[PDB]
């Protein structure tokens, strides 16, 4: 189906404890493939997926160079934003950036992205048109002015429509064994009595990839949207994900409850029940 590529960057100032820390990672869909940490022994972008290792020394040198440049511009920007927000140089602040593209089954650009946040809040973002900007405040408006005057959008658009989609397609082919293989969830329902009056029914989904999945409980065919406890999809550590949903059902009424599982790796949505 559709795929995506994303580069995530975080810079965190730490006054009195050296220069800001910089960490960036790259993903294709939900697979981490490259990382860089300014605090590592000899900072260099490293592979985190097998299909990227085949890239040549030139690839890695350029990537490492870009990471370091970004690290440097973030340090300058952190100082700049202190001014924009009339803030003291005593506190720790955060600058976050994400950019990348989404491509459809045919490998055509579906959407491009480029957004920044300061201290966890929206700062400035490139609009879906890849030509205009949305500034969160008067401070961000100043950055907008600089970027428009510098034609940043034009260049970003060029990358997003070109290199971004091209290399994503290249990565999808080189790592097809894994990037184009969906591991359906292994599912089951557990039952834990709470008291004489009720019990806990928990629907499990394990070892699935990609992360996207829908788990829902029904009582007599009615979605328990309001009465369902759903934990955040979590990484198992081996590339796959896990998740569960649970409801508190009046003891004896377990059979009126059905769990429904939707995952692209499943030919058809699943329906599970507690089998005592």
């Amino acid at each position: 189906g559709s795929h995506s590529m994303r580069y995530f960057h975080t810079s965190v100032s730490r006054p009195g404890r050296g220069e800001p820390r910089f960490i960036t990672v790259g993903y294709v869909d939900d697979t981490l493939f490259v990382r860089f940490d300014s605090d590592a022994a000899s900072p260099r972008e490293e592979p985190r997926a097998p299909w990227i290792e085949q890239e040549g020394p030139e690839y890695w040198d350029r990537e490492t160079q870009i990471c370091k440049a970004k690290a440097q511009t973030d340090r300058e920007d952190l100082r700049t934003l202190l001014r924009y927000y009339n803030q003291s140089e005593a506190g720790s602040h955060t600058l976050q950036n994400m950019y990348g593209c989404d491509v459809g089954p045919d490998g055509r650009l579906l959407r491009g992205y480029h957004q920044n946040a300061y201290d966890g809040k929206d700062y400035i973002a490139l609009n879906e048109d890849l030509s205009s900007w949305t500034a969160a405040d008067t401070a961000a408006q100043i950055t907008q002015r600089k970027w428009e005057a510098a034609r940043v959008a034009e260049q970003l658009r060029a990358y997003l429509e070109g290199e971004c989609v091209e290399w994503l397609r290249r990565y999808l082919e080189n790592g097809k064994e894994t990037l184009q293989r969906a591991d359906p969830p292994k599912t089951h329902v557990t039952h834990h009595p709470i008291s004489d009056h009720e019990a806990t029914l928990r629907c499990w989904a394990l070892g699935f990839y990609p992360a996207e999945i829908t788990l829902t409980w029904q009582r007599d065919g009615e979605d328990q949207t309001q009465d369902t406890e759903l934990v955040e999809t979590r990484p198992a550590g081996d590339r796959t994900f896990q998740k569960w949903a649970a409801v508190v059902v009046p003891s004896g009424e377990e059979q009126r409850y059905t769990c429904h599982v939707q995952h692209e790796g499943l030919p058809k949505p699943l329906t599970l029940r507690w089998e005592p």
């Binding site: 440049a69 920007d77 700049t80 970003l156």
Partner: peptide, 10 residues
């Protein structure tokens, strides 16, 4: 593959 526009500051 990453993108880069030299000197892009906020």
């Amino acid at each position: 593959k990453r993108w880069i526009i030299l000197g892009l500051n906020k």
